[PDB]
Structures are given as structure tokens and as C-alpha cells.
Amino acid sequence: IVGGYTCGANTVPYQVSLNSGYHFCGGSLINSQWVVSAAHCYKSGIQVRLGEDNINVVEGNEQFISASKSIVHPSYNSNTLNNDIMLIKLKSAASLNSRVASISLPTSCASAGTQCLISGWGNTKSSGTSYPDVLKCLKAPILSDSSCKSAYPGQITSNMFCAGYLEGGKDSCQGDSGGPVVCSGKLQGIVSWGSGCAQKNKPGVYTKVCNYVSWIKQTIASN
Ligand SMILES: CCCCCC
Numbered sequence: 478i479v480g481g482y483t484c485g486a487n488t489v490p491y492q493v494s495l496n497s498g499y500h501f502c503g504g505s506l507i508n509s510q511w512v513v514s515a516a517h518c519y520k521s522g523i524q525v526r527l528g529e530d531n532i533n534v535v536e537g538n539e540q541f542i543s544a545s546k547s548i549v550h551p552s553y554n555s556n557t558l559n560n561d562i563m564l565i566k567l568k569s570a571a572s573l574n575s576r577v578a579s580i581s582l583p584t585s586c587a588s589a590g591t592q593c594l595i596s597g598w599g600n601t602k603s604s605g606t607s608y609p610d611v612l613k614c615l616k617a618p619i620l621s622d623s624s625c626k627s628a629y630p631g632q633i634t635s636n637m638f639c640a641g642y643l644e645g646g647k648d649s650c651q652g653d654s655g656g657p658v659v660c661s662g663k664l665q666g667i668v669s670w671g672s673g674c675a676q677k678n679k680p681g682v683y684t685k686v687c688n689y690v691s692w693i694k695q696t697i698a699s700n
């Protein structure tokens with residue numbers, strides 16, 4: 478997260494870290510056995526780390542659980558990032574408590590202007606590289622589709638939305654992918670892509686979760 482702030486230990490209980498010997502993508506716990514992330518984060522040998530603050534130190538509250546199955550959306554397109562969503566089934570159910578909790582799926586889509594919380598352990602430098610040990614947070618409003626499509630002409634699909642600041646300085650970044658965009662206690666987006674990080678006139682693009690609520694429920698129900 479570029480231009481964000483330290484969330485504080487376990488203040489974002491639904492945030493997960495996708496680990497393969499290092500942190501590569503974020504995720505959101507939606508129930509005791511399922512995590513939602515980005516399709517472009519897919520990789521074999523994933524271990525889901527719950528209750529994390531400092532990802533480089535064991536401080537207590539962590540739960541390491543192996544991914545039992547990763548379901549990339551069948552219509553995911555790696556070139557356009559359309560349908561950039563993936564479900565991860567945990568080998569065993571997580572123990573829910575104060576430090577580890579699930580986030581709710583939206584009932585309706587969010588409107589332009591809705592303020593959301595974006596979090597992750599991604600790069601904190603727009604021009605350069607710096608990875609944090611602890612979880613960073615950022616408050617960002619959902620932008621209007623007109624401004625979004627104006628920023629990325631012909632690249633925004635009905636399954637994406639822009640969130641952030643057109644003046645730059647605050648945005649998600651590499652390493653934040655797959656992470657949650659929570660608005661009014663509802664998971665509205667998944668960190669997907671952007672042109673660089675915190676660049677002027679180049680907001681972050683996120684997977685529009687409200688379009689997939691039925692897909693999620695049906696897939697989970699049959700697996
Ligand atoms: C990282 C412990 C072994 C499985 C991959 C994290």
C-alpha cells in the first residue's frame with residue numbers, strides 16, 4: 478500500500494496472506510473454510526496464513542493452513558484480467574475469534590463515492606521498492622465509471638471498478654493483489670491491477686465482487 482498507514486495488529490481479521498515461502502498475494506476470509514483472492518495470484522503449494530500482523534515474525538494469533546483447492550474463475554482472461562477472482566478452500570477450518578474473522582459478501586453493489594478500506598503487505602513505494610513487515614491500510618473512495626473508463630480507455634469491463642485518488646500518492650500496489658476492498662462491512666472488491674502504483678490519473682482497478690456473489694455461493698455449495 479502506497480501512502481497508507483499501519484492498521485494495527487489484528488484490526489483487519491479477515492485479511493489473509495498467501496504464502497509460498499514468502500508473501501505473494503493477499504486474500505479475504507469469507508467463512509471458516511474459504512478464502513477469496515485474485516485469479517492472477519494462482520499458484521500451486523499455497524499456504525494460507527491467518528491472524529497475521531508482522532509476516533516475518535511469529536507473534537501469536539497466527540494460523541497456518543494449507544490450501545486444499547484453488548478454484549480460478551473459468552472465464553478468467555490473463556491478458557485483460559477480466560474475471561480476476563479465485564476461491565481457495567482450506568484443508569481444515571480456521572478457528573474464528575477476535576483476531577480471525579470472516580467478512581460478508583455484498584448484497585448490492587457499492588456506488589461511486591463509497592469510502593472503503595484497502596489493506597495488504599504489498600510494496601509501499603510507487604517509484605521503487607519497499608515491503609513492510611506489518612499490515613498497511615488505506616481509505617479510498619470508489620470512483621465513477623466515467624472517470625474509470627477515461628483513465629483506462631477500453632480496458633475496464635463491467636466486472637471492474639476504479640478506487641483511489643486521481644492526484645496520486647495513495648494506492649494499492651504489487652503484493653496487495655488478491656486483497657480486500659471493504660465498504661460498509663462488505664467485501665466489494667479484490668485488488669487486481671493498475672498502471673504502476675500511486676500514479677497521477679491512474680487509479681487502482683479492482684474486481685467487482687458483487688457481480689460474483691451467486692457464482693461464489695454456487696461454487697462453494699458444490700465443493
Ligand atoms: C511455507 C511452509 C511450507 C508450505 C508453504 C509455505
Ligand SMILES: [Ca+2]
Binds near residue numbers: 531532
Ligand atoms: Ca507473524
